[PDB]
């Protein structure tokens, strides 16, 4: 995902998320929507499965 890093300013872990790494070719069963927003430096997330 990247080569290297020098210094950082922020990080976060939150609760663990469990997901399936097996890929198939069947029809879809879930829909996920995400909204990314920035006013005054505020990074906003809006999501609901």
């Amino acid at each position: 995902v990247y080569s290297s890093a020098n210094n950082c300013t922020f990080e976060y872990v939150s609760q663990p998320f469990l997901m399936d790494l097996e890929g198939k070719q069947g029809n879809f069963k879930n829909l996920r929507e995400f909204v990314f927003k920035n006013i005054d430096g505020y990074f906003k997330i809006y999501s609901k499965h």
Binding site: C8, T9, F10, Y12
Partner: protein, 49 residues
């Protein structure tokens, strides 16, 4: 080391007496629980007495 996005607790810092130096330049340590900052940085090194 950068310390951020956390609620500070200097109570245990001055309620201990094992330290030898508690000089706070610029800002007065008598009011630290009333002050909200953006960033906290903490260096660490060993030096002779």
């Amino acid at each position: 080391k950068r310390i951020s996005n956390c609620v500070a607790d200097y109570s245990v810092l001055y309620n201990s007496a094992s330290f030898s130096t508690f000089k706070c330049y610029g800002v007065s340590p008598t009011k630290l629980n009333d002050l909200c900052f953006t960033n906290v940085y903490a260096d660490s090194f060993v030096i002779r007495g």
